[PDB]
Design a protein around this ligand. Structure first.
Ligand SMILES: [Cl-]
Ligand SMILES: [Cl-]
Ligand SMILES: [Xe]
Length: 162
């Protein structure tokens, strides 16, 4: 298991524009296109992202490309963030993947705001962090996914994904 496979599981793969768990226009492997209610707008962002007139649909390869770029940007964002990087460098490889997943889903800004969980993770207080992480909107809105990420932080193994 790796970051790519883990997110491909959490996110799924869809070749036509769809709305995510929050009602926003997305395509591929959880690639958010826009928060705008407009489908034209979503189509417009898509075409710009792909470099062609896609008309709302893309190929598997195009989807994989976006995903690569998105995973890359997520790591980069973590490494460029002063509240995140330290946590991330302090973690083992499995738990780093959990942190990337959250960033991919919620943006760096949003993850940087879990101050207390970030500190517990940094101190290696696994159970405590897992309890604190669940006290969140993220956990109440997408509980299944959140449980898998949380278990990963708690155990440092990929069991939630096996
Ligand atoms: Cl893009
Ligand atoms: Cl979920
Ligand atoms: Xe976190």
């Amino acid at each position: 298991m790796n970051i790519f496979e883990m997110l491909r599981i959490d996110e799924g793969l869809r070749l036509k524009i769809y709305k995510d768990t929050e009602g926003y226009y997305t395509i591929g492997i959880g690639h958010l296109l826009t928060k705008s209610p407009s489908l034209n707008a979503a189509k417009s962002e898509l075409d710009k992202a792909i470099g062609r007139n896609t008309n709302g649909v893309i190929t598997k390869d195009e989807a994989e490309k976006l995903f690569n770029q998105d995973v890359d940007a997520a790591v980069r964002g973590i490494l460029r963030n002063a509240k995140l990087k330290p946590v991330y460098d302090s973690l083992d490889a499995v738990r780093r993947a959990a942190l990337i997943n959250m960033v991919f889903q919620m943006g760096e800004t949003g993850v940087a705001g879990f101050t207390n969980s970030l500190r517990m993770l940094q101190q290696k207080r696994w159970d405590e962090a897992a309890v604190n992480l669940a006290k969140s909107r993220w956990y109440n809105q997408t509980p299944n996914r959140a449980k898998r990420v949380i278990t990963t932080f708690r155990t440092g193994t990929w069991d939630a994904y096996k």
